[PDB]
Amino acid sequence: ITTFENKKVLVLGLARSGEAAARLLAKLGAIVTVNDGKPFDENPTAQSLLEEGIKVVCGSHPLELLDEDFCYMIKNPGIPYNNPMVKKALEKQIPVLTEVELAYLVSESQLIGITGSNGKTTTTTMIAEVLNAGGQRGLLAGNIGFPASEVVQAANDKDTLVMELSSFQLMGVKEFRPHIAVITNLMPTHLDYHGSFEDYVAAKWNIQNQMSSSDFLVLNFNQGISKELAKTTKATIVPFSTTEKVDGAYVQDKQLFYKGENIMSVDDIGVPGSHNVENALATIAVAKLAGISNQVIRETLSNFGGVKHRLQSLGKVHGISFYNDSKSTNILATQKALSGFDNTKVILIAGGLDRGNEFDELIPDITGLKHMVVLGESASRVKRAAQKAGVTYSDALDVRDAVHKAYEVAQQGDVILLSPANASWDMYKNFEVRGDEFIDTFESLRGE
Ligand SMILES: [Cl-]
C-alpha cells in the first residue's frame, strides 16, 4: 500500500480512534497533521503524538489549514457534517473518510461488519465468540474490541475481523467491503446528526456499496424496510426473521433454524428476551455462512452470558456486588445503568475526560445514592452534581483507587458500579482498558 506515501493527511479529532489512525497513516508514509478542539495542555493524546513527531493543532480549527495540499481527511465519526472543517474539506474536494476505511485498505483479513440501530454490541460479541469456538480466529474491532486501525496491524489472512460499525463511520467509507455484513434493524436513531430517517438509513446502507453477489448481507426481515432495501443491493441476501420462515435464520416450533437445519431452542439462548433471540438469529446466519458447525453454534449461544464492560456483573466480595459499566461514556448511558438499581445500595464511580459540560441532567438519577467516588479530568463537575443531589462523595486517583475506596465504604448487600458518564481518554486509551482496571482490582480484592 503506497497510496499514502508522502501525502499530507489531516486527522480531525482524536477521541477513540484518531491516535490509531494518525499512527497507522505515519507508518504508511503519510505526513500527518492532527487537529483537535481540546487545548494542548489538557490533551494527553496530542502531547504523546507531538512526541512521536506528528504535527498537532489544538484548541482551534483554522479553516486555512485546508488550503494546504491535503490529499485526505480522516474525521472522528461523531463530528457532524455541518462542522466548518468538514464543510471546507468538501468544498476543497479533499476526500473525507473515517478510520474504518483506512483499516479496510490495509487489511489482509476476512471482514465481517455489523451495524444497525440497536443490538450491535451483543450481536458482534456473539459472532466473535462463535467463530472462535469453531476454530476460526475472530478479532473484535471497530466500536468494540479495539479501533479497527489498531486491530488490522496485528491481524493476518487467517484472522476474521468482527467489526462493530456505526452510521457515523459508514458516512465515511469508499472502498470498504465486508464479505459478510449485518444490519440488525433500522429505526429512528441519531436524527440530530443525520437529519432525516432516510439519510440515516442511507448512511448505514453504504456498508454494502462494494459488496458483490459473492458477498452476504444479513437483514432483519421482521421489518418491511429490509425487504425494500434488499431489492437494491448486489449482495446475496441472507434474512433473519421471528415472524415467518425465510431463506436464512428463523424461528420454527420454538427452535432456531437456518435454511431447514434445526440449530437450538429459543429458550436455551444464554441471555433472555426477544431482542436477544434476534441477535442470536443474526449470529446464526453469520456463523453458518462462515461454516461454523451447528453443535458449536448451539453450545456457544447457550452459554453466552453478556458483554464485557456493559453492566457487566463480576460477582461478589464479602457480599458486595461489582458491576463494570465502563462502556457508559455519557450522561444518558449512566442514567440508564442506574435505572435498574436501588440507589440506596449503590456506590457509583464516575468522572473522566472533560468535554466541558456540567452534570445537572444526572441529578435526579443519582439522588439517593449511598456514595459517589469521583475521578478524572471532569471530577469537579461531577462533584457539583453530587453536591446538588445531596450525595456524599470522595476523590480517587484512578479506577483502581476508586474501587478500593468504594469497597472500604461498602457493606454486605451493596453494589459497586463503574458507570462513568464520561469518556476514558484523559487516563485510559479506551473504555476497555478502563474496565479492565476495574476487573483487575475486583479480582485482587476477591482472591483466587
Ligand atoms: Cl473508547
Curated annotation (Swiss-Prot):
GO cellular component: cytoplasm
Catalysed conversion reaction: UDP-N-acetyl-alpha-D-muramoyl-L-alanine + D-glutamate + ATP = UDP-N-acetyl-alpha-D-muramoyl-L-alanyl-D-glutamate + ADP + phosphate + H(+)
GO terms, biological process: cell division; cell wall organization; peptidoglycan biosynthetic process; regulation of cell shape
Name of the protein this chain belongs to: UDP-N-acetylmuramoylalanine--D-glutamate ligase
Enzyme class: ligase
Keyword Phosphoprotein: no
UniProt EC number: 6.3.2.9
A family per Pfam: Mur_ligase_C
Annotated family: Belongs to the MurCDEF family.
Record keywords, A-Z: ATP-binding, Cell cycle, Cell division, Cell shape, Cell wall biogenesis/degradation, Cytoplasm, Ligase, Nucleotide-binding, Peptidoglycan synthesis
Gene3D superfamilies: Mur ligase, C-terminal domain (3.90.190.20), Mur-like, catalytic domain (3.40.1190.10), NAD(P)-binding Rossmann-like Domain (3.40.50.720)
Gene Ontology MF terms in the entry: ATP binding; UDP-N-acetylmuramoylalanine-D-glutamate ligase activity
Listed InterPro entries: Mur-like_cat_sf, Mur_ligase_C, Mur_ligase_C_dom_sf, Mur_ligase_cen, MurD
Subcellular localization(s) per the UniProt record: Cytoplasm
Top-level taxon: Bacteria
UniProt lineage: Bacteria, Bacillati, Bacillota, Bacilli, Lactobacillales
Free-text function comment from the UniProt entry: Cell wall formation. Catalyzes the addition of glutamate to the nucleotide precursor UDP-N-acetylmuramoyl-L-alanine (UMA).
Pathway note: Cell wall biogenesis; peptidoglycan biosynthesis
Residues reported in the UniProt entry to bind ATP: G116, S117, N118, G119, K120, T121, T122
